[PDB]
């Protein structure tokens, strides 16, 4: 139904968002970016692996949907439906056009919206998985399988940050002990030595 993904692999056009100028864009193939036990607290899943893009290219919303299912099914089978949390880190905002031929030719060749893609840079995280530290093997295998749904080269990388947080795993526990970090569900709020001293009193009372 759609052209082979080699036709829209490269970031050749400027970003083309669905806006008030580009009307008629069909809905993206991927509508869910978080799945698994999304409600696990920050402290339940210390491990985090990433699928990191090694190329500057465009991924179709179809391949994001395909990879998500691929990585999600393998985790449900090797860790259980409540043993992980998957977050797809790319959103298909750039719109790809089509100049449909059956005949004007190249006259009036500007194309109609055909789909959506995510523009991914080198070193940019495609999708992330957080789970328990004893499932590190199953995370790598899930992301290794999902690579086959994407064009180009992607690298797997087990992060040093605690879960989906921005704070290193080697010190995350210490910061929570002294109330520099406050769990707020999947993540942690950061407490600076700033602001009204009342907020400090509340945290220490």
């Amino acid at each position: 139904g759609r052209r082979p993904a080699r036709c829209y692999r490269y970031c050749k056009n400027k970003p083309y968002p669905k806006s008030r100028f580009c009307r008629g864009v069909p809905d993206a193939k991927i509508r869910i970016f978080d799945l698994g036990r999304k409600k696990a607290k920050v402290d339940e899943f210390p491990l985090c692996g990433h699928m990191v893009s090694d190329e500057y290219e465009q991924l179709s919303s179809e391949a994001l949907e395909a990879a998500r299912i691929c990585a999600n099914k393998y985790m449900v089978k090797s860790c259980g439906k409540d043993g992980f949390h998957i977050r797809v880190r790319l959103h298909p905002f750039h719109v790809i056009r089509i100049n449909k031929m059956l005949q004007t030719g190249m006259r009036g060749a500007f194309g109609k919206p055909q789909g959506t893609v995510a523009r991914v840079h080198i070193g940019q995280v495609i999708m992330s998985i957080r789970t328990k530290l004893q499932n590190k093997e199953h995370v790598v295998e899930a992301l290794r399988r999902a690579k086959f749904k994407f064009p180009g080269r992607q690298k797997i990388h087990i992060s040093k940050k605690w879960g989906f947080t921005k704070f290193n795993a080697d010190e995350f526990e210490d910061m929570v002990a002294e109330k520099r970090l406050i769990p707020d569900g999947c993540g942690v709020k950061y407490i600076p030595n700033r602001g009204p001293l009342d907020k400090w009193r509340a945290l220490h009372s």
Partner: protein, 159 residues
């Protein structure tokens, strides 16, 4: 093609800076402009009268006429292979005294004094500027501290 509109492409050029809209400070209107002065042209979108044309925004000219509200400026404009001395009428909101010559006038006064003062003291002083010379030989004391050894760091995939 494009349009020949007078203010095409001035969306940002003539807009006011961030959180600097509103009333125009009155010192803008208290400046004294004299024939021969050098002024930098800068269109201000708050006042739409006497607006300089976009091609003159960011150019520097010379005042030749002074009226109640505006001045006449002789400003070079390049059109293709020739440069034309153009005469524009610009309300004094859209100009400011150029400080490019002030450094020169400061130097002239300093030059003349040194020229005058040194003459009565029978000495030759330098007056002409010079380009920065290569730095002269010098000693670097170590203060009994071995220079810190530097090494390249290992690669890490901090992705």
């Amino acid at each position: 093609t494009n349009t020949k509109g007078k203010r095409r492409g001035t969306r940002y050029m003539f807009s006011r800076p961030f959180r600097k809209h509103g009333v125009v400070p009155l010192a803008t209107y208290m400046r004294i402009y004299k024939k021969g002065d050098i002024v930098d042209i800068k269109g201000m979108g708050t006042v739409q009268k006497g607006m300089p044309h976009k091609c003159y925004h960011g150019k520097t000219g010379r005042v030749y006429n002074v009226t109640q509200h505006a001045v006449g400026i002789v400003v070079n404009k390049q059109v293709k292979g020739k440069i034309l001395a153009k005469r524009i009428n610009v309300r004094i909101e859209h100009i400011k005294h150029s400080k490019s010559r002030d450094s020169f006038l400061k130097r002239v006064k300093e030059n003349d004094q040194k020229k005058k003062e040194a003459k009565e003291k029978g000495t030759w002083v330098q007056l002409k500027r010079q380009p920065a010379p290569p730095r002269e030989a010098h000693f670097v004391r170590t203060n009994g501290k071995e220079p810190e050894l530097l090494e390249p760091i290992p690669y890490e995939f901090m992705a």
